[PDB]
Amino acid sequence: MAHMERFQKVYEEVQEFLLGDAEKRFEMDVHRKGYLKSMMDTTCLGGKYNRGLCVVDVAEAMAKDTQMDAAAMERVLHDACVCGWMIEMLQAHFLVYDDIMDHSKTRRGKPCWYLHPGVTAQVAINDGLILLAWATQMALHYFADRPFLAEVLRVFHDVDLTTTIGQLYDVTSMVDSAKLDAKVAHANTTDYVEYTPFNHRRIVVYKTAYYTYWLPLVMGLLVSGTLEKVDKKATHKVAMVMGEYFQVQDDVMDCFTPPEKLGKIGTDIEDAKCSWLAVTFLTTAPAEKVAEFKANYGSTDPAAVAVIKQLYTEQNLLARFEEYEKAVVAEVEQLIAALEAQNAAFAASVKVLWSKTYKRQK
Amino acid sequence: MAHMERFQKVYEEVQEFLLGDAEKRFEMDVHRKGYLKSMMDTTCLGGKYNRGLCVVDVAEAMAKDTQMDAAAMERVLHDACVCGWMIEMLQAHFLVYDDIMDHSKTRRGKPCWYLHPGVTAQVAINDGLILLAWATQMALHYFADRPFLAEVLRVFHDVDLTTTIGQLYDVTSMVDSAKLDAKVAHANTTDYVEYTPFNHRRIVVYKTAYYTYWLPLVMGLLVSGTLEKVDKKATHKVAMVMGEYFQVQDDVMDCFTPPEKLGKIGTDIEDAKCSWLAVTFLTTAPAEKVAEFKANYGSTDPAAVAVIKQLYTEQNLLARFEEYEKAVVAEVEQLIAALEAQNAAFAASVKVLWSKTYKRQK
Ligand SMILES: CCCCc1ccc[n+](CC(P(=O)(O)O)P(=O)(O)O)c1
Ligand SMILES: CCCCc1ccc[n+](CC(P(=O)(O)O)P(=O)(O)O)c1
Ligand SMILES: CC(C)CCOP(=O)(O)OP(=O)(O)O
Ligand SMILES: CC(C)CCOP(=O)(O)OP(=O)(O)O
Ligand SMILES: [Ca+2]
Ligand SMILES: [Ca+2]
Ligand SMILES: [Ca+2]
Ligand SMILES: [Ca+2]
Numbered sequence: 075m076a077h078m079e080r081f082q083k084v085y086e087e088v089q090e091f092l093l094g095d096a097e098k099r100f101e102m103d104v105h106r107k108g109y110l111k112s113m114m115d116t117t118c119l120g121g122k123y124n125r126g127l128c129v130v131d132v133a134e135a136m137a138k139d140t141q142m143d144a145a146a147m148e149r150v151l152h153d154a155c156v157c158g159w160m161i162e163m164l165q166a167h168f169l170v171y172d173d174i175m176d177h178s179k180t181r182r183g184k185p186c187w188y189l190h191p192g193v194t195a196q197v198a199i200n201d202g203l204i205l206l207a208w209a210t211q212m213a214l215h216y217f218a219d220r221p222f223l224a225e226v227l228r229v230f231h232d233v234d235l236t237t238t239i240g241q242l243y244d245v246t247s248m249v250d251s252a253k254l255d256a257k258v259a260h261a262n263t264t265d266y267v268e269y270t271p272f273n274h275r276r277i278v279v280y281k282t283a284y285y286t287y288w289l290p291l292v293m294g295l296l297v298s299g300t301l302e303k304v305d306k307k308a309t310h311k312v313a314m315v316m317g318e319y320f321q322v323q324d325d326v327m328d329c330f331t332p333p334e335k336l337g338k339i340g341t342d343i344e345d346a347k348c349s350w351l352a353v354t355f356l357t358t359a360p361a362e363k364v365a366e367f368k369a370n371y372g373s374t375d376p377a378a379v380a381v382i383k384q385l386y387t388e389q390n391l392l393a394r395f396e397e398y399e400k401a402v403v404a405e406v407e408q409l410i411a412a413l414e415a416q417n418a419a420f421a422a423s424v425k426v427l428w429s430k431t432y433k434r435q436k
Numbered sequence: 437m438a439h440m441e442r443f444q445k446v447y448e449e450v451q452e453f454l455l456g457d458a459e460k461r462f463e464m465d466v467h468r469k470g471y472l473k474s475m476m477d478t479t480c481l482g483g484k485y486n487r488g489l490c491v492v493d494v495a496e497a498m499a500k501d502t503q504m505d506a507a508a509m510e511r512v513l514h515d516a517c518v519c520g521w522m523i524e525m526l527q528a529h530f531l532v533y534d535d536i537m538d539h540s541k542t543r544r545g546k547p548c549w550y551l552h553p554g555v556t557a558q559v560a561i562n563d564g565l566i567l568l569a570w571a572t573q574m575a576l577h578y579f580a581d582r583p584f585l586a587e588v589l590r591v592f593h594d595v596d597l598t599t600t601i602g603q604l605y606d607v608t609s610m611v612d613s614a615k616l617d618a619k620v621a622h623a624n625t626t627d628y629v630e631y632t633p634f635n636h637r638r639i640v641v642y643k644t645a646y647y648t649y650w651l652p653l654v655m656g657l658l659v660s661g662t663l664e665k666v667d668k669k670a671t672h673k674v675a676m677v678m679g680e681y682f683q684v685q686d687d688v689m690d691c692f693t694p695p696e697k698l699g700k701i702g703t704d705i706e707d708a709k710c711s712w713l714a715v716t717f718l719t720t721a722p723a724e725k726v727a728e729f730k731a732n733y734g735s736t737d738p739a740a741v742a743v744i745k746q747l748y749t750e751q752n753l754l755a756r757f758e759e760y761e762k763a764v765v766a767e768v769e770q771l772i773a774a775l776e777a778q779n780a781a782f783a784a785s786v787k788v789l790w791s792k793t794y795k796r797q798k
């Protein structure tokens with residue numbers, strides 16, 4: 075929408091900055107400079123830019139609600155774009171690692187970075203660290219004289235921590251939690267006791283909600299200097315609700331949306347993930363169907379996978395998702411009404427975010 | 437080792453903080469807390485603690501020099517221990533990843549983290565991110581009301597960046613740099629045209645000197661509030677010299693120090709990495725020797741690795757290292773004497789660091 079063109083211009087600026095700083099500081103040669111350019115473009119581009127563009131929608135909503143001159147509005151928007159790129163590059167970094175962890179094939183319609191034959195998991199592992207480091211470099215450089223530098227770093231780093239703990243819950247969700255010893259191999263579960271609504275919510279809140287919903291909102295507020303003009307606790311709550319839903323959508327599109335339209339080949343089923351479908355199925359389905367699920371789940375065999383999808387379809391998981399979505403919409407709507415009573419400007423930028431989220435198809 | 441007891445007590449302190457904060461903020465369960473505890477202990481302990489201890493030695497030298505009273509000195513030492521642990525965790529993070537990247541077997545006399553049977557490289561990859569995040573968490577918590585907080589973050593993230601570019605030079609150094617395409621597999625070199633003193637210096641200065649020499653000295657100065665009492669240029673210079681040399685010793689020991697004494701099993705020869713021995717040997721040995729080294733280096737075959745070590749031995753590599761160490765001793769001493777003319781206290785703390793480095797055996 076409104077800010078794409080400006081946001082993409084800032085990408086070019088920030089890339090030239092970053093590559094030039096490496097030349098100046100690290101004696102970066104021409105070939106590695108180009109490798110780094112292709113790496114940044116491959117990992118950071120091609121997504122929907124929902125997190126980055128939110129920073130800009132929020133910042134501008136709040137800046138217009140303030141009285142400021144042309145140069146100050148221009149500054150807010152530019153800083154917002156830089157902040158948005160910190161988050162997109164945080165995403166880039168998380169996706170490089172997660173694609174390795176999940177041993178996946180495609181991301182955003184192209185092979186996963188680690189799967190580029192001129193890269194491999196060995197180089198990709200270090201490329202991911204460069205991405206994370208650059209996001210902090212952006213703040214240190216662009217916001218060196220800004221009052222919100224310290225607060226930006228604190229929220230960005232807190233969120234980076236939060237997401238790694240989220241990923242921890244995710245990556246250990248298929249193993250009995252009583253059996254984690256860094257000294258003993260552990261088999262995947264066969265009984266699925268821990269596939270509970272509580273465990274699924276815990277995963278999604280921490281691995282997705284904080285960095286996808288909370289971070290863009292807060293950063294938008296930080297760069298426009300209006301973080302003390304909104305109810306902190308309601309902002310966190312609406313971000314948790316939308317974020318949980320956003321990840322329920324993800325765990326509901328990797329089992330029913332063609333890879334081709336999504337841009338990625340989910341393997342929740344093969345990998346026995348504690349997805350919203352698995353928890354919803356395990357807690358509502360009849361007993362023979364639960365057993366048949368346990369004999370088929372967690373299996374690479376395409377015939378086992380097809381059995382799970384058939385069981386999910388018989389269980390009416392799409393319709394259960396529709397009902398959950400109605401409940402979410404009801405709650406979001408009212409959290410937004412209450413934010414609107416306090417700060418109508420901020421509440422509008424929450425609608426813009428929610429609009430890009432509700433009933434999305436990829 | 438005046439500060440070891442205090443340093444270790446701070447580790448217990450910081451660990452209990454970190455685990456407790458995840459309980460409070462991420463609904464961390466008792467099993468993953470236990471997992472996290474063992475991960476921390478396994479990846480962060482068992483090293484020599486040169487980096488961490490140097491922060492405290494520098495901080496104390498400067499606090500004595502500025503005549504701090506007992507209250508102030510106790511704060512400075514405690515802050516210095518936290519900074520020290522930020523660096524030891526940075527190291528922890530770097531080695532978790534590097535062990536994966538290098539496919540190594542032992543770190544500090546135990547199996548590499550990713551090789552723990554209950555871990556695997558899948559989990560280790562996210563674990564390494566938790567270590568990095570925790571490093572920032574320490575500063576955000578303990579230095580929340582400290583004016584040096586921003587400069588601590590700044591130098592920390594800069595050095596982390598520098599090291600990852602350092603690591604990029606390392607992992608791409610055995611492939612032809614003109615053939616650095618992400619779309620095209622890269623065969624390892626057969627002619628070694630890029631195995632030069634310039635390329636070797638660039639690798640080790642960036643992957644090693646910054647975080648191992650410069651980062652500890654600076655943090656010791658920042659926490660004691662004395663960074664504005666020493667020559668920044670001379671400080672950086674002496675860090676670069678000691679740090680390159682520190683990497684040279686690490687390269688010499690890969691080939692000549694028994695894995696047992698060392699705590700690790702280097703595969704420089706098998707991976708044919710741009711070490712200080714290979715580079716020197718190539719630009720010191722003849723053509724017949726160079727040709728025999730080209731048809732032996734980069735092979736996992738035990739006989740071929742024995743040929744390499746035998747070439748090195750016959751080319752008197754140990755002896756060329758002694759001579760190199762003489763020139764470095766002459767130059768470090770001159771640079772310390774120069775520092776000592778300006779602030780005797782900081783120069784003495786650079787000597788403490790030098791003396792734990794010069795002629796170390798592991
Ligand atoms: C290292 C943090 C990885 C964080 C993270 C958080 C949320 C989603 N992902 C990737 C998704 P996907 O690969 O985009 O479908 P997941 O594997 O379903 O969770 C990664
Ligand atoms: C991943 C970031 C850089 C990691 C890094 C930096 C310096 C030395 N090391 C490890 C050593 P070692 O594995 O301790 O011998 P190297 O593999 O010889 O370089 C790792
Ligand atoms: C958060 C998680 C579901 C990963 C996918 O995030 P996304 O769908 O926003 O991906 P893009 O960055 O490619 O838009
Ligand atoms: C820089 C590189 C040689 C890394 C190993 O560093 P180190 O020998 O200081 O390791 P410890 O932290 O185990 O003492
Ligand atoms: Ca994934
Ligand atoms: Ca995943
Ligand atoms: Ca998914
Ligand atoms: Ca190594």
Ligand SMILES: [Ca+2]
Nearest residue numbers: 534537538606
């Ligand atoms: Ca290495």
Ligand SMILES: [Ca+2]
Nearest residue numbers: 686687690702
């Ligand atoms: Ca080594």
